[PDB]
Amino acid sequence: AKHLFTSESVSEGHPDKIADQISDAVLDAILEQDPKARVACETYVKTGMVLVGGEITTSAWVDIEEITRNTVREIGYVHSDMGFDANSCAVLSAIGKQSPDRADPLEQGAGDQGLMFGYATNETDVLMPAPITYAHRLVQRQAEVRKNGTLPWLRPDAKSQVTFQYDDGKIVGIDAVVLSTQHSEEIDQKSLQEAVMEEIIKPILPAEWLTSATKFFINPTGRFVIGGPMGDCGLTGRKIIVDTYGGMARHGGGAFSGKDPSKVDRSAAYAARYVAKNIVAAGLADRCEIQVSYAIGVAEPTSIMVETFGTEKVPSEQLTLLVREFFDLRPYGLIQMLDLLHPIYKETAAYGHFGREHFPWEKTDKAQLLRDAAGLK
Amino acid sequence: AKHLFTSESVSEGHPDKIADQISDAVLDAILEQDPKARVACETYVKTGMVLVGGEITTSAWVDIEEITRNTVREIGYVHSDMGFDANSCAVLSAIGKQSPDRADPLEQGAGDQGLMFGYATNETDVLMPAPITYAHRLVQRQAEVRKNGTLPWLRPDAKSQVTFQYDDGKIVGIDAVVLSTQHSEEIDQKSLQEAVMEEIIKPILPAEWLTSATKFFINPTGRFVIGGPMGDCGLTGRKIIVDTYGGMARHGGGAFSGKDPSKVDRSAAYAARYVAKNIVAAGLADRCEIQVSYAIGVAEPTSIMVETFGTEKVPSEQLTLLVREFFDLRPYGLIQMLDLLHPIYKETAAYGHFGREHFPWEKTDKAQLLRDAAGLK
Ligand SMILES: Nc1ncnc2c1nc(Br)n2[C@@H]1O[C@H](COP(=O)(O)OP(=O)(O)O)[C@@H](O)[C@H]1O
Numbered sequence: 001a002k003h004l005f006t007s008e009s010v011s012e013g014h015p016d017k018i019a020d021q022i023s024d025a026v027l028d029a030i031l032e033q034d035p036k037a038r039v040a041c042e043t044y045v046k047t048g049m050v051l052v053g054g055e056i057t058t059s060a061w062v063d064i065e066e067i068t069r070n071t072v073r074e075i076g077y078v079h080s081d082m083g084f085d086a087n088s089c090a091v092l093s094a095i096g097k098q099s100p101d102r103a104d105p106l107e108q109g110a111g112d113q114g115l116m117f118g119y120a121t122n123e124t125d126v127l128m129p130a131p132i133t134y135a136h137r138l139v140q141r142q143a144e145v146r147k148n149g150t151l152p153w154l155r156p157d158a159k160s161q162v163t164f165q166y167d168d169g170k171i172v173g174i175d176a177v178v179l180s181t182q183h184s185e186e187i188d189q190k191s192l193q194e195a196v197m198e199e200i201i202k203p204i205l206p207a208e209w210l211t212s213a214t215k216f217f218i219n220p221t222g223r224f225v226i227g228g229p230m231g232d233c234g235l236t237g238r239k240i241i242v243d244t245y246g247g248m249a250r251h252g253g254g255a256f257s258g259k260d261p262s263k264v265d266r267s268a269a270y271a272a273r274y275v276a277k278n279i280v281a282a283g284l285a286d287r288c289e290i291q292v293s294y295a296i297g298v299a300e301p302t303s304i305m306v307e308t309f310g311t312e313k314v315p316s317e318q319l320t321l322l323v324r325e326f327f328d329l330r331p332y333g334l335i336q337m338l339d340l341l342h343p344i345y346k347e348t349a350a351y352g353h354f355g356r357e358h359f360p361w362e363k364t365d366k367a368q369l370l371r372d373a374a375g376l377k
Numbered sequence: 378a379k380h381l382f383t384s385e386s387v388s389e390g391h392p393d394k395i396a397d398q399i400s401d402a403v404l405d406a407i408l409e410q411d412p413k414a415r416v417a418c419e420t421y422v423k424t425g426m427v428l429v430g431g432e433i434t435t436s437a438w439v440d441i442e443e444i445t446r447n448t449v450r451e452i453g454y455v456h457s458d459m460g461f462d463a464n465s466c467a468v469l470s471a472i473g474k475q476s477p478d479r480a481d482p483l484e485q486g487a488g489d490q491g492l493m494f495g496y497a498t499n500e501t502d503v504l505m506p507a508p509i510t511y512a513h514r515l516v517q518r519q520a521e522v523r524k525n526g527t528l529p530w531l532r533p534d535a536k537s538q539v540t541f542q543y544d545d546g547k548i549v550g551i552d553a554v555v556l557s558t559q560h561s562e563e564i565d566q567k568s569l570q571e572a573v574m575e576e577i578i579k580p581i582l583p584a585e586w587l588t589s590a591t592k593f594f595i596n597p598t599g600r601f602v603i604g605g606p607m608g609d610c611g612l613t614g615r616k617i618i619v620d621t622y623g624g625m626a627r628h629g630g631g632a633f634s635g636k637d638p639s640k641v642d643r644s645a646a647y648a649a650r651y652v653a654k655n656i657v658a659a660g661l662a663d664r665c666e667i668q669v670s671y672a673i674g675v676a677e678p679t680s681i682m683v684e685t686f687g688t689e690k691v692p693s694e695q696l697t698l699l700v701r702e703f704f705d706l707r708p709y710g711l712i713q714m715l716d717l718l719h720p721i722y723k724e725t726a727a728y729g730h731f732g733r734e735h736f737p738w739e740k741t742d743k744a745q746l747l748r749d750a751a752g753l754k
Pocket residue numbers: 016231232238415416417432433434475488489630631636640642
C-alpha cells in the first residue's frame with residue numbers, strides 16, 4: 001500500500017551530537033588506558049561552555065579539558081563568527097572518580113534494568129532501513145564537502161530528513177527531502193542551493209528514486225549563519241532515534257554515548273542489532289525486530305521477543321530457539337561475543353551507530369550457522 | 378502467539394525525571410505569565426547541583442532558583458542523608474532571555490523539522506498499552522504510599538518494569554515484575570519486600586494476571602539507601618520512551634519537557650495521541666499508530682502514515698482521508714485544536730504524558746464524527 005515514512009539525521013556539530021561525541025571521546029580516552037573502566041559521562045553544551053559531568057570508576061588519568069577542545073576543533077568550531085570557538089570556550093568538569101577496590105564472570109548479572117530493541121531489513125545494501133540510511137548519508141556528505149575544501153563556505157551545523165514512499169515494502173521512491181546547512185556570510189542562498197543540490201543531494205539520493213515530483217527543501221527559511229551551541233543547547237542521548245534506525249523500529253529508553261559496555265542500554269542494543277542482522281543475512285526472515293530486556297542482578301534476559309512481520313522462512317518458535325542459542329545475551333556474554341572493551345566508540349557518535357559495516361555488531365559471521373540449524377536451505 | 382513484551386517506568390525523584398519536572402515547572406511558571414512565550418529550557422542535575430539552561434523569549438520574569446527548589450522539595454529531597462537537599466543544593470542558571478520585538482496565523486509554518494508518532498490500542502481502559510500503564514501505576518503507587526505516611530521509610534527514587542505475556546493480542550498475564558525503591562536505613566530488606574508486595578504490587582497488578590509463575594524481583598541487589606542525584610545524573614528528555622508508550626510503538630527523536638507548544642516535537646506528538654485515540658474509540662480500528670512529520674517553514678505536514686495492523690473496520694485510504702479531515706495538523710492548528718497555551722505541563726512530567734484522561738490530547742470528543750464519516754456503524 002502506498003504510505004510515506006520519514007526519518008531525520010543531523011551532522012557532527014549539531015549541538016546534541018557535539019555532546020555525544022565529547023562523551024564518547026572521553027570514554028575512548030579512558031578505555032584506551034583502562035579497558036575495564038566503568039564510565040557514565042554526560043555532557044551539556046550551551047553558548048560559552050561545555051560541562052562534562054560524570055561518574056567514572058577507573059585507574060586512568062585523562063585530560064577532560066584537552067579531550068573536549070580537541071573534539072570541538074575536529075568538528076570545526078574554531079572562531080566566534082561560527083557561534084563557538086574550541087580554543088576559547090569554557091570547559092567545566094564535574095566527574096566523580098572512584099578508583100577500584102559470581103564464580104563464572106559470564107554469570108555476572110545486569111547492572112540496571114531495561115529494554116533494548118534491534119532491527120534489520122533486507123531493504124538496503126547494509127541491512128538497514130532506506131530512510132535513516134540516506135538521511136545519514138546526506139549529512140555525512142555535507143561534512144565531507146565541508147571538510148574537503150570543495151564547498152568551504154559550509155559551516156558545521158546541519159540537519160537532513162528524507163521521506164520515502166513505499167508500496168508495500170518496496171521503496172518506490174523519495175517524496176521529499178529537506179536539508180539545512182550553516183554557512184558563511186560569504187555565500188548567498190540561491191548560490192547555496194545550486195551547490196547543495198549538485199554536490200550534496202544529487203550524488204547521494206538514487207536517481208531512479210528522484211522524480212519530477214520530489215519536493216526538495218534546501219535551507220527553507222534559511223540563512224543559517226551562526227549555529228552549533230549559539231542559542232541551541234546540546235545534551236547527550238538526545239539524538240537517540242537518529243542514532244538507532246530513524247524510527248523504523250522501536251527503542252527502549254536508552255542512550256549510548258558516554259556509557260562503557262557494562263551498560264546494557266548500549267551493549268544489549270548493539271547485540272540485538274547483531275542478532276537481527278545475522279537472522280536476515282541467513283534468509284530466515286526479511287525484516288526482524290528483537291526486544292531483549294534485563295532485570296538488575298539477574299544475568300539471563302527476562303524476555304526475548306522476535307517479530308518477523310509475516311516475513312519468516314521458519315516459525316517464530318524455531319527462530320526464538322536459535323536466537324537464544326547462537327548468542328550469549330548475558331551482559332558479560334554479549335560483551336565477549338562482540339569484543340567490546342576497546343576504544344572504538346567516538347566513531348559511533350555521529351552518522352549512526354548501525355549500518356556502518358566495520359563495527360563488531362555489524363558482522364554477519366553467524367549467517368550460515370543460523371541458516372543450518374534453522375533447517376538448511 | 379505467546380510472546381513477551383517489557384516496558385519500564387521510574388518515579389518522580391529518579392534524576393532524569395527531576396530534570397524533566399524542573400524544566401516543565403519553569404515552562405508552566407512562564408506560561409502562566411505569558412502564554413505565548415517561547416521556551417526551550419534544558420536541565421542537568423548532579424550531586425550538588427541543578428543547572429537550568431535555556432533559551433527563553435518572553436516578557437515574563439520568573440525566579441528560576443525558587444522554582445527549582447520548590448520542585449525538589451515536593452519530590453521530597455530535603456536532607457543530605459537522602460542524597461540531595463532542596464534547601465542547600467546549588468542552582469545555576471544559563472538562560473538566554475530575549476523579549477519579543479503569514480496572513481492566517483494558522484498557516485504559520487513549522488519551527489524545526491521532524492517526525493512524531495502516536496498510538497492507541499483497545500487493550501486498556503485508557504486506550505494505552507497494558508505494560509507501560511501498569512509500569513507507571515507501580516511507581517505512582519510507590520510515590521503515593523511514600524507521600525501518604527503509610528510506608529514512610531520509602532525515599533524518592535524508584536524504578537519499575539513489568540513484562541507481559543500476550544498470546545496474540547490478548548494480554549494473557551504477567552511473567553515478571555521488578556521494582557526497586559530507595560529506602561531509609563531504618564527498614565530491612567525482608568521487611569521491605571513484604572510491604573512493597575502488600576501495599577504497592579498487590580493492589581495494582583490485576584490478580585488474574587498474577588500467577589504462581591510470576592517472577593517478582595523487589596530490590597534485587599538492593600539496599601537502595603542514597604539515591605536521586607547522588608552518583609546518578611539527570612538530564613531532560615532522557616526518559617523519552619517512558620514518557621510515551623514503554624516502547625510498544627515507535628518514536629521520533631524528540632523530547633517534550635521544557636518545550637513550549639510551538640515545538641512540534643511536543644505538540645504534534647500530543648496531537649498524534651489525540652488522533653489515534655479518537656480513531657480507536659470510534660471503533661475504526663483496534664490498534665493505531667500514526668507518523669506525522671514536518672519540514673521547517675512548511676505548514677502542512679510533509680507525511681502522514683496510519684498503521685492499523687490488520688485491525689481496521691474501514692480501509693486505510695478512508696482512514697487517512699478522515700485523519701487529514703477532522704484534525705488540523707498545521708503547527709498552529711494543532712495548538713488551537715487542543716488549546717495548549719496554558720500552564721498544564723508540570724503534571725505531564727512524571728507518570729507519563731498519555732493515558733491520563735484529563736489532558737487535552739486524551740479527549741475522545743471526535744469519536745462519533747469519525748465513526749459517521751467513516752461509514753456509520
Ligand atoms: N531563543 C529560543 N527560544 C526558544 N526556543 C529556542 C530558541 N532558539 C532555539 Br534554536 N529554540 C528552539 O527550541 C527547540 C528545542 O531544541 P531541539 O533540541 O528540539 O532542536 P533539535 O530537535 O534539532 O535537537 C529547537 O528545535 C528550536 O526550534
